[PDB]
Amino acid sequence: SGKVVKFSYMWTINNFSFCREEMGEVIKSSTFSSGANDKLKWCLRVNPKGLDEESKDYLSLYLLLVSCPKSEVRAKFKFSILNAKGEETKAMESQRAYRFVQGKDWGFKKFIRRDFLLDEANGLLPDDKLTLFCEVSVVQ
């Protein structure tokens, strides 16, 4: 079977400044698929107020492998924010592929400073909307 081997997931969180999540709490995206017969299932998990105390000043952002047909897959990934014109900003990338076993995440605990993100001058929350962009490439 042919496979979707690279994919870009776009997710807009409305009223981002209004997120009531406390530190440690998560917003989980819808599940998206890739690979042999949509058999790789993924989602994003974001902590608007950081994963933990170390990251209390940041938004934390992770890619989760929800399920896979075998034990694992290896994948490279990149996260960025889209500005009002749909252009990528503040990208962070994994560089190498990471081992995703079923149920495991990988990402950036200190993806972006909350104060920087929330400041209207920086144009990262047009209409108070956060648009995240996740590009994934799965090792074959």
Binding site: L51, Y62, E93, S94, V101, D105, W106, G107
Partner: peptide, 10 residues
């Protein structure tokens, strides 16, 4: 660059 996971396992 600064990639971590919320869990770890041996």
């Amino acid at each position: 660059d600064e990639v971590t996971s919320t869990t770890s396992s041996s």
